[PDB]
């Protein structure tokens, strides 16, 4: 897993991509329905996200507790970068699903999105201006999975030191993979390091948007909206019986 | 400022460093008051932060309104990365000021720090394990200033496009500078790109910690605690 080539890593990540899901509304029927639609869509995406995470090279080498911690920290960032990616070719709008495309004025009335709708649109625009490639996108999504929770392993066991070292080794292999993609494309070494930094700085903005989103979700005080550690544990703690 | 060499950029940033300030308490009186000490310390740091920002190459080429927007987004991240930096050589503790060093158990009783004390300690430990250098630290703090608010200008005027392009040129020049520092130190090209990414990924964690801190500050409902756009505007004028 730490022995994949860059091309093999990219191939693995592309193979592991989850599907784009639909909103569950009757398209023959005529608000506050937006949060209901989004909550339902995110619930169904989360199941596929768990399957995807298990195929990110290196991720299933971690303990199940550490897998759960990472997913707990990252899942809304991962939903949001997917949203931004799908919206890249739809300026001024967010493609929540192929049947749920909203513009900014419509977003103005979506619960919890008073700040974040415009932040997501700006991110999508930035991706378009950089001409972000699918291979780069899947690298960034893997980086979020591995990085977002790594500085909150409040554990100091020998095993935890081993876990963090591994996570940093996988992150390093993804950095190498991103650089290789840029070299294949013919970028100079200076352009490669500049572009690597541009992409990684966007991750800080995705964290920001996720924190603002999570603030809203907790404010709802709805028992099942933020996935619990124990729920994520049940989905990740698979048997081998299938 | 887009014509500085990497070495000149580093010297400029090192020259521009703000001082380390002290907490204001009677060192002869007992101890227990932490949020009051920290809000006062942050208030006095903010004035020096504005002077520092104006010496970050490229920053004053921006409009006043865009300078305010950047500082409004970034100022707690900038305070927090400074805190993490001065705590690097104090494992298990946070050096809020040279006269205000608290351990983890003491942090347990500090308002608003139920989550972020441990997060700041983890960041300091990560800086120590990477052997972060002062030259790298000042580059990262400048990146935070230029990056944190750049995807929230919510403007598409020709002037705004010009402003965003400039911000990214300055960011690109700091990336070049970071890479040059790593090359001077003898890192291979592979080690350079890996270390650049490690450093920039820590910035996401600094954003996380600032958002958690800002949530607590807004919860205080204290009129002067979160600096207003208009207050920052007066200081930046
Ligand atoms: C930014 C849109 C958004 C959400 C979203 C973003 C990308 C997707 O692929 C699917 C849903 C969001 C995500 C999760 C939501 O509820 C969690 C349900 N249990 C996992 C509710 C809404 C939302 C909006 C307001 C507040 C927080 C998130
Ligand atoms: C992490 C410690 C912290 C803060 C701190 C961090 C680094 C410093 O150099 C100085 C102050 C902090 C910062 C700002 C505070 O009030 C803002 C006052 N107007 C600018 C209050 C506390 C704090 C603690 C709880 C909630 C939010 C921030």
From Swiss-Prot, chain A:
Impact noted for substituting residue 231 to A: Abolishes interaction with NCOA1, NCOA2 and NCOA3
Residue pairs linked by disulfide bridges in the UniProt entry: none
Gene that specifies this protein: ESR1
Subunit composition and interactions: Binds DNA as a homodimer. Can form a heterodimer with ESR2. Interacts with FOXC2, MAP1S, SLC30A9, UBE1C and NCOA3 coactivator. Interacts with PELP1, the interaction is enhanced by 17-beta-estradiol, the interaction increases ESR1 transcriptional activity. Interacts with EP300; the interaction is estrogen-dependent and enhanced by CITED1. Interacts with CITED1; the interaction is estrogen-dependent. Interacts with NCOA5 and NCOA6 coactivators. Interacts with NCOA7; the interaction is a ligand-inducible. Interacts with PHB2, and UBE1C. Interacts with AKAP13. Interacts with CUEDC2.
Recorded consequence of changing residue 56 to E: Has higher transcriptional activity in the absence of wild type ER. Inhibits transcriptional activity when coexpressed with the wild type receptor
Native species: Homo sapiens
Keyword match Nucleus: yes
Keyword Nucleus: yes
Interval of the full protein contained in this chain: 307 to 550 of 595
Misc. comment: Selective estrogen receptor modulators (SERMs), such as tamoxifen, raloxifene, toremifene, lasofoxifene, clomifene, femarelle and ormeloxifene, have tissue selective agonistic and antagonistic effects on the estrogen receptor (ER). They interfere with the ER association with coactivators or corepressors, mainly involving the AF-2 domain.
Region annotation (Self-association) ranges: 1-242
Residue span(s) of domain NR LBD: 5-239
Residues with lipidation of kind S-palmitoyl cysteine: 139
Function: Nuclear hormone receptor. The steroid hormones and their receptors are involved in the regulation of eukaryotic gene expression and affect cellular proliferation and differentiation in target tissues. Ligand-dependent nuclear transactivation involves either direct homodimer binding to a palindromic estrogen response element (ERE) sequence or association with other DNA-binding transcription factors, such as AP-1/c-Jun, c-Fos, ATF-2, Sp1 and Sp3, to mediate ERE-independent signaling.
Protein name as annotated: Estrogen receptor
Record-stated family: Belongs to the nuclear hormone receptor family. NR3 subfamily.
Swiss-Prot record, chain B:
Domain NR LBD: start-end pairs: 5-237
Tissues where the protein occurs: Widely expressed. Not expressed in the pituitary gland.
Keywords assigned: Activator, Cell membrane, Cytoplasm, Disease variant, DNA-binding, Glycoprotein, Golgi apparatus, Lipid-binding, Lipoprotein, Membrane, Metal-binding, Methylation, Nucleus, Osteoporosis, Palmitate, Phosphoprotein, Receptor, Steroid-binding, Transcription, Transcription regulation, Transmembrane, Ubl conjugation, Zinc, Zinc-finger
Modified residue annotations for Phosphotyrosine: 229
Region (Interaction with AKAP13): 1-237
Effect annotated for changing residue 231 to A: Abolishes interaction with NCOA1, NCOA2 and NCOA3
Positions contributing to 17beta-estradiol binding: 45, 86, 216
Superkingdom of the source species: Eukaryota
One GO BP annotation of this record: antral ovarian follicle growth
Region named Transactivation AF-2: 5-237
Localization of this protein: Nucleus; Golgi apparatus; Cell membrane
Primary location: nucleus
Lipid moiety-binding residues (S-palmitoyl cysteine): 139
Keyword Membrane applies: yes
Post-translational modification: Phosphorylated by cyclin A/CDK2 and CK1. Phosphorylation probably enhances transcriptional activity. Self-association induces phosphorylation. Phosphorylated by LMTK3 in vitro. Glycosylated; contains N-acetylglucosamine, probably O-linked.
Consequence of substituting residue 67 to H: In ESTRR; results in highly reduced activity
Region of interest (Self-association), residue spans: 1-237
Annotated Gene Ontology cellular component terms: chromatin; cytoplasm; cytosol; euchromatin; Golgi apparatus; membrane; nucleoplasm; nucleus
Record note on domains: Composed of three domains: a modulating N-terminal domain, a DNA-binding domain and a C-terminal ligand-binding domain. The modulating domain, also known as A/B or AF-1 domain has a ligand-independent transactivation function. The C-terminus contains a ligand-dependent transactivation domain, also known as E/F or AF-2 domain which overlaps with the ligand binding domain. AF-1 and AF-2 activate transcription independently and synergistically and act in a promoter- and cell-specific manner. AF-1 seems to provide the major transactivation function in differentiated cells.
Family: Belongs to the nuclear hormone receptor family. NR3 subfamily.
Disease link: Estrogen resistance: A disorder characterized by partial or complete resistance to estrogens, in the presence of elevated estrogen serum levels. Clinical features include absence of the pubertal growth spurt, delayed bone maturation, unfused epiphyses, reduced bone mineral density, osteoporosis, continued growth into adulthood and very tall adult stature. Glucose intolerance, hyperinsulinemia and lipid abnormalities may also be present.
Function noted in UniProt: Nuclear hormone receptor. The steroid hormones and their receptors are involved in the regulation of eukaryotic gene expression and affect cellular proliferation and differentiation in target tissues. Ligand-dependent nuclear transactivation involves either direct homodimer binding to a palindromic estrogen response element (ERE) sequence or association with other DNA-binding transcription factors, such as AP-1/c-Jun, c-Fos, ATF-2, Sp1 and Sp3, to mediate ERE-independent signaling.
């Amino acid at each position: 897993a730490l022995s994949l080539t860059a091309d093999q890593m990219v191939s693995a990540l592309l193979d592991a991509e989850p599907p784009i899901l639909y909103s569950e509304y009757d398209p023959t029927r005529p608000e506050a329905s937006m949060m209901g639609l989004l909550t339902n869509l995110a619930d169904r995406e989360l199941v596929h996200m768990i399957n995807w995470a298990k195929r990110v090279p290196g991720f299933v080498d971690l303990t199940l507790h550490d897998q759960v911690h990472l997913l707990e920290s990252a899942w809304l960032e991962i939903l949001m970068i997917g949203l931004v990616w799908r919206s890249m070719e739809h300026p001024g709008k967010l493609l929540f699903a192929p049947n749920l495309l909203l513009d900014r004025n419509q977003g103005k009335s979506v619960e919890g999105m008073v700040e974040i709708f415009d932040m997501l649109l700006a991110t999508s625009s930035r991706f378009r201006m950089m001409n972000l490639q699918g291979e780069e996108f899947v690298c960034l999504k893997s980086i979020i999975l591995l990085n977002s929770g790594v500085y909150t392993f409040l554990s100091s066991t020998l095993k935890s030191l081993e876990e963090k070292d591994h996570i940093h080794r996988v992150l390093d292999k993804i950095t190498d993979t991103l650089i290789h993609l840029m070299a294949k494309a013919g970028l100079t070494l200076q352009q490669q390091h500049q572009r690597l930094a541009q992409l990684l700085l966007i991750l800080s903005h995705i964290r920001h948007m996720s924190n603002k989103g999570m603030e809203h979700l907790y404010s709802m005080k709805s028992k099942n909206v933020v996935p619990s550690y124990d729920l994520l544990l049940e989905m990740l703690d698979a048997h081998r019986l299938h």
